[PDB]
Amino acid sequence: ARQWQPDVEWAEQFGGAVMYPTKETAHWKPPPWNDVDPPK
Amino acid sequence: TMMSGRPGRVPLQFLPNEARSLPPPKLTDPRLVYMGFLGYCSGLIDNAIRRRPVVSAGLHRQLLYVTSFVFFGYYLLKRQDYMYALRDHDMFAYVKSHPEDFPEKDKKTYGEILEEFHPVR
Amino acid sequence: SSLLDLIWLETILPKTTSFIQMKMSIMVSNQKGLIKLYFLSFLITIMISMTLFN
Amino acid sequence: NVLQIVRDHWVHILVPVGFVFGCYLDRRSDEKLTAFRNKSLLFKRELRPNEEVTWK
Amino acid sequence: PFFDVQKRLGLDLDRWMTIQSAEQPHKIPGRCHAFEKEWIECAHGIGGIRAEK
Amino acid sequence: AKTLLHKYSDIPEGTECHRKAYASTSIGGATGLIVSAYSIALKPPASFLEGVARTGRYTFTSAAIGAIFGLTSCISAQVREKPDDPLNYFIGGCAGGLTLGARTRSYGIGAAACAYMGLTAALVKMGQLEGWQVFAEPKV
Amino acid sequence: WIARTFYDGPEKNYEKTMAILQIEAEKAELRLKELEVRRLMRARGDGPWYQYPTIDKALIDHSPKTTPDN
Amino acid sequence: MPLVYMNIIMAFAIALAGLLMYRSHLMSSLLCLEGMMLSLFIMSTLIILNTHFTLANMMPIILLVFAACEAALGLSLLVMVSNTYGTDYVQNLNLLQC
Amino acid sequence: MNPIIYTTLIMTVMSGTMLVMISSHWLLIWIGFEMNLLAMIPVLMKNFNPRATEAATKYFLTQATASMMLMMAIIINLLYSGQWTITKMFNPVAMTMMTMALAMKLGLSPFHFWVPEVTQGISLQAGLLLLTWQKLAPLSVLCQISQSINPNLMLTMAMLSILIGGWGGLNQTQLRKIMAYSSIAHMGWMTAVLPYNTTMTILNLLIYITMTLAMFMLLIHSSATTTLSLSHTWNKMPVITSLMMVTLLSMGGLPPLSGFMPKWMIIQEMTKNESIIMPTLMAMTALLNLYFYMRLAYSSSLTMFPSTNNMKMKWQFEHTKQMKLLPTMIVLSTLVLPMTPALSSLN
Amino acid sequence: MLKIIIPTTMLLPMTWMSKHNMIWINATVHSLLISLISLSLLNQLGENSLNFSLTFFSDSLSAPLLVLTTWLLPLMLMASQSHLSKETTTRKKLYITMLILLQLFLIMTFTATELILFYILFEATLVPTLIIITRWGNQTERLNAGLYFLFYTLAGSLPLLVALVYIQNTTGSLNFLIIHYWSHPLSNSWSNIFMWLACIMAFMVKMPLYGLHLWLPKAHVEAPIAGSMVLAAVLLKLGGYGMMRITTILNPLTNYMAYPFLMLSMWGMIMTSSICLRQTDLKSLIAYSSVSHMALVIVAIMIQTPWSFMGATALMIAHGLTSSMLFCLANTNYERVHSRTMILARGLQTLLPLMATWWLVASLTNLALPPSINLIGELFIITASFSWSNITIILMGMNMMITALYSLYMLITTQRGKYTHHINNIKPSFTRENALMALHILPLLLLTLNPKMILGPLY
Ligand SMILES: CCCCCCCCCCCCCCCCC[C@@H](O)O[C@H](CO[C@H](O)CCCCCCCCCCCCCCC)COP(=O)(O)OCC[N+](C)(C)C
Ligand SMILES: CCCCCCCCCCCCCCCCC[C@@H](O)O[C@H](CO[C@H](O)CCCCCCCCCCCCCCC)COP(=O)(O)OCC[N+](C)(C)C
Ligand SMILES: CCCCCCCCCCCCCCCCC[C@@H](O)O[C@H](CO[C@H](O)CCCCCCCCCCCCCCC)COP(=O)(O)OCC[N+](C)(C)C
Ligand SMILES: CCCCCCCC/C=C\CCCCCCCC(=O)O[C@H](COC(=O)CCCCCCC/C=C/CCCCCCCC)COP(=O)(O)OCCN
């Protein structure tokens, strides 16, 4: 009765570091929201 | 074609003097009308982006967009027509000066030409 | 309905293209970000271009 | 009420206007293809005493 | 691409350095002055293709 | 450079099976060496010996592909006695593709490779016959 | 009445088609001629097109050069 | 083309290969770039002096100056990289990837 | 940095590009390249953070190596003919070295590796400048020596650029990497026609710059740097997302959009030189760019993604600083196909 | 021809400056007026054409297609009225804008004196349809469907462009009249074979040819009602029109190249028809019926005889009308049941008798009952195929049989039997739906009076 729209499950497909994750890139983390890293 | 090296070309002129011997495009040229339409669309999109009444937010701004587009369009049309005139001029001059490379083909009628016939069966 | 239309006609044109382009995209974009490898490849390309195109 | 319903019914006028404008543009496009008027081998005709063109 | 400002305004920003045979200081000649002069006066105003051939 | 290609083209299509096979083997070896060099540069796998093992694997694979291609194409050409025929090249390409699948040891790749390689070899033969240019000179 | 009010005689369409055919045949001939002329000028270089630059001869210094043999 | 020019060319090629190898230590990359500059200077100077093309004697100086400035620029960048990691190691620059 | 210093550095970048364009001496072209590189580095690092510094050092290394190769080519060309004027390259591999140096400056494959990561490191204004203005000088130099170029090398690099851009863009969720791979593909298209007609190269560059400027200005306006951040934009400024989807379709080469004009013309030009296989491969490969543009359009405007509660606050504020020419850029990147024959102006 | 192009453009400002509650009325009225004006195009000559100008020309192959294109917009508006009621005024105006743009592009496509302009508008029709499918689509697969409908098409049409420009480099013109008058035979060669394939497969993908038809069930199932109508009625006929236009240059090569596709069609019309027998979805069944009919049209075009061309034209027009009406009926059921499954809602004749009569007439036309124009086209194609070869009749005959079966199957599963007990929200049919079916069906039974108006230029 309602037009389907994306949900969180569908949205998380575009949240990774890359599309099509593989074993080598499985440990890749998306960059910080602001382009700043901890100085460590 | 590469008319960049064409002799007697001033390095940075939009319109040479010899282009003034060609008829200027009319003010009701369809291309000028399309350029004005492009300006009007730019005005509408400007109104929409700033979150203003699209049709009737700034009429002075929309008029200025249309005027600028028509201005640049008229001058661009003049330059484009000039360039095509140059291309045709060089074409005809080279054909005239090289009669051996463009021989007159013999005129023949279909009554004495034998073309293969392929029936559709 | 099943064997040709939903399985093999789908396997031949669309799915093969999708799989091949996905594999090629993964291969091209899987770069470690190390300029060491990039400049070694640059050296290889320079030698190949000198040795092949003349 | 005139000048009040017009503000709400003015949109209707646009489509007919486009049609008459298109007819005018068709006639203008026709007048630029008159290079063979009354010169074809099939329809070559002598003008009437008060005729300037065969087709307009 | 190439915008020929020097030719349009007659500025000569860098043409003085392009060739050996163009007004060296104290009239010091290049080692191949005559050959380059002959090549230039051969190929002037003729175009690249005809000059190569 | 182009020397290998000239040695391959100098041989007639319907003669000298061994010469064509050897020239194709050399060309395949060169292609495998280049792809191995790029793979090693962009991906240092683990060490010197594993790298040279991977290089040898790729080189032998490509050399085998080229060898089977040339051999099968030339035998088909001689047997059929119809040179300048695209189908003979296609047969060689499919055979070459089949060999690649065998090295891989997966049936799916062999079928895919055979069709794709055969089509490509037939296209190359057609382009040779009709003079199709990949890198055309600037005529106009 | 329909023919009188809405349509026109056959001669109008006939002659308009003749004019259109003339225009487009001329355009096709001009296109072939342009391709041939471009090929010839680019191969030879004796026309106004494809004129690549050469060194200006007004740059050469014609004066004694401290050495008789230039 | 005598053997001196060819030796300078080979020196330039060796410097370029060393630059593109990147064992480690971006400072070595800068050193290879500066070796490339020096080979360019030597080759250009020999060419200009041999041909007696007087007005081009300015060219090496300008060359040197400009590329020397480039070196300064590179050094500054190196310093900041070190100040982020404590070392100028090449592999430390892997936050950005293709 | 200080606004006056930023203006001065930008003017120095533009002055370096103009010096490359207007000069007829190889040394002055090299000087212009050096000046552009020298003034470009602070612009990338205007916003200070480790990522920007790494991007700047990558860019410096690549551009310095390219400048050294270019000077090496100039020296060889002088050695084999005492000429400093930018004309016929007068030699073998000196021309090859010049071509490789200019390809590395442009980002043509296989020298493309620096573009995605340098674009990712820097901000969106820096990315806009890097992907638009930094292509004018090497392309002008290439247009000047187009007759010297060995067609095989340039066509190989152009085909590789198109293939690599198409394949690399498919894997990306970050918008700056998408723009970088799109730039690589469009560079391949631009250089694939240099051996045949430089007017087509300039027209492609102009259209690409217009579309890229519109895309980057839309990205900055709706300050999103990833796919999911852009997926929230419909809930605040849906007209921006609609314009962005239209511009994405335009960049994909779909008629009757503006992005169809370059490819079409380029293909046409090569068919005049009886090259048939290459244009077909180029179009079939540009299908990949169209695919990932369509994926971005799906995630952007054709579907409504989940939003957040805190977006409600954003509903109450407008943009203080507005970008002029953005409407003009969108219009010029979308609705200029009927004015196609204007390219005879030798744009 | 600008007398039709300009008003369709004026439909846009009229829509955007309308009331929030008067957009549908205004759009419907002015679309119907434009259709009435375009009725003028039907008058044709036994000679060449109606050459309006250097840019647009009309023929008796273009005229029925143009009339159907103009007529289809008001019906699309009427059917789109219902499911867009809860949409904001801006988005409803955007939907109407997409429909108007699509009509304008189709109108300019069917005149298209030059082949590159035809190609540009032919591929311009891709964008509004894609947005309609992927934006106002109910299911989650619409996005996937859109991708299919895009890339297939482009995969077929990117080579065509190359071929087209190549032709202009050799002949000098792509103007249809000069291409007709200056035609020359194509020699059998690898280059000519590939140029033939590049010219043909672009239009082969959109018919669609069996084996290249996969995008069609997806695009038809996942699109809204207006999208389905425009896809089945007109957008499938672009390939047939393009083949009729472009085959004048592919002879004598076409006879040699006909076999690979003819088989794929002659066997294909069997397979797809058989697929219609086992289908749990109405929209997929109607899509596969469209595939079968267009396969027969492909055969007719490839045979290349006057009877073939007349039959193909008549079948294209008739199939457009019939498939549009069938999709409308299925949508009226779907808007009540929300299921899109044939077996779920049954016995609808007892509940909705007039809609059952509409279903019967639509299925009878789909079944090719004489003397409907559907059977005129089918019969002309069958006679032409028999003249081509006497064995084709077997295949043709089987298809006819199979067609009848599934048609009546579709009528019996949904209309006859016992109603589903637990469905109690089947309200009586509105005047809107009944008028929609009437306006689909009456032109068919009126065109069966004057067949020569849809039989094409070879009549
Ligand atoms: C008993 C009668 C039987 C026949 C009935 C016929 C009725 C005809 C109605 C349908 C006609 C369709 C239009 C056909 C042509 C229209 C387009 C074009 O061809 O005509 C234009 C002209 O169109 C007409 O001017 C206007 C036609 C408009 C018809 C509208 C009828 C329906 C209106 C309904 C309004 C209802 C009232 C409002 C209620 C709210 C251009 O003609 P023009 O270039 O000049 O011709 C010159 C001919 N010359 C050169 C030989 C002199
Ligand atoms: C989206 C398409 C691009 C849009 C770009 C922005 C449009 C606005 C531009 C505003 C005006 C710019 C022109 C500047 C006026 C004087 C410039 C003059 O000095 O230059 C002349 C040249 O004039 C310009 O080049 C023409 C610019 C016009 C660009 C428009 C054509 C774009 C293609 C058609 C798309 C339709 C767009 C329609 C709306 C803009 C002389 O050039 P010349 O030194 O002798 O030769 C150099 C070129 N060579 C080296 C290759 C030989
Ligand atoms: C249920 C209760 C019913 C009660 C009513 C009973 C009345 C009995 C009549 C019912 C049908 C019997 C048919 C009897 C024939 C009469 C009509 C026929 O004679 O006219 C036809 C003529 O009709 C038309 O040709 C057919 C109508 C065309 C339909 C076009 C539709 C227009 C708008 C629709 C939109 C377009 C969508 C489709 C795109 C193509 C054939 O005439 P024709 O002998 O030949 O010559 C005409 C006159 N001449 C001699 C001057 C030349
Ligand atoms: C959804 C999938 C549909 C995809 C359809 C795509 C296939 C279209 C057919 C081939 C496309 C390219 C054809 C070439 C375009 C026309 C150019 C032309 O006519 O000129 C030919 C061009 O010839 C070629 O270039 C052919 C090269 C083909 C390379 C690409 C091959 C792709 C695979 C083809 C095999 C498959 C065939 C059936 C495909 C069906 C679709 C699935 C002659 O060459 P000239 O240079 O002019 O020679 C004159 C002097 N002797």
Side-chain angles (χ1 to χ4, degrees), chain J residues 240-383:
Chain J
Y241 169 102
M243 286 196 222
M244 277 148 175
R245 289 292 194 225
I246 204 164
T247 46
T248 176
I249 80 174
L250 298 182
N251 284 305
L253 197 62
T254 292
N255 306 355
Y256 170 70
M257 302 278 307
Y259 294 74
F261 305 95
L262 277 169
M263 299 313 95
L264 269 171
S265 292
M266 267 181 222
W267 186 240
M269 59 170 85
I270 304 299
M271 292 284 83
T272 56
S273 285
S274 296
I275 293 179
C276 282
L277 287 169
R278 301 282 304 280
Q279 273 293 317
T280 70
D281 206 323
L282 269 174
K283 292 204 77 177
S284 296
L285 190 142
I286 300 155
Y288 277 107
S289 84
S290 295
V291 179
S292 296
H293 296 311
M294 288 299 108
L296 184 76
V297 172
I298 294 174
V299 172
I301 293 186
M302 273 305 134
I303 301 299
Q304 183 144 340
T305 64
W307 281 65
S308 290
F309 272 37
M310 294 183 286
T313 313
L315 185 47
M316 282 202 273
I317 301 296
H319 164 269
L321 275 172
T322 302
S323 51
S324 181
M325 183 177 177
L326 283 178
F327 274 123
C328 281
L329 292 153
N331 172 66
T332 61
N333 267 358
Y334 174 87
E335 277 174 1
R336 268 154 179 86
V337 180
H338 301 303
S339 171
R340 205 161 81 270
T341 291
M342 211 185 298
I343 193 66
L344 193 151
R346 288 163 271 115
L348 292 164
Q349 185 175 330
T350 54
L351 317 172
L352 298 173
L354 195 62
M355 202 53 72
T357 289
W358 295 131
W359 272 97
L360 173 72
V361 190
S363 291
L364 280 193
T365 61
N366 185 56
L367 180 139
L369 193 65
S372 68
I373 50 171
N374 304 63
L375 187 153
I376 296 172
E378 299 254 349
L379 198 45
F380 288 8
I381 297 170
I382 282 165
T383 307

Side-chain angles (χ1 to χ4, degrees), chain A:
Chain A
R2 203 161 64 166
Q3 174 176 17
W4 173 91
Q5 291 298 344
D7 51 352
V8 161
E9 189 195 60
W10 175 273
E12 291 195 300
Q13 285 171 343
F14 311 93
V18 294
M19 311 275 318
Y20 315 140
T22 52
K23 298 175 184 178
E24 171 173 348
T25 65
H27 284 334
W28 287 15
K29 180 179 281 295
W33 308 107
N34 68 328
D35 299 286
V36 172
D37 277 319
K40 100 181 75 173

Side-chain angles (χ1 to χ4, degrees), chain C residues 1 4-6 9-11 13-15, chain J residues 148 152 210-214 218 275 288:
Chain C
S1 178
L4 311 182
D5 205 78
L6 276 177
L9 287 180
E10 199 91 18
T11 301
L13 202 41
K15 301 290 183 165
Chain J
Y148 270 65
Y152 265 84
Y210 178 71
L212 296 180
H213 67 290
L214 289 196
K218 288 182 161 60
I275 293 179
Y288 277 107

Side-chain angles (χ1 to χ4, degrees), chain J residues 39 64 67-68 71 317 321 443 446-447 449-450 454:
Chain J
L39 210 53
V67 172
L68 173 67
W71 176 249
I317 301 296
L321 275 172
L446 285 177
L447 278 169
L449 287 171
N450 206 348
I454 61 162

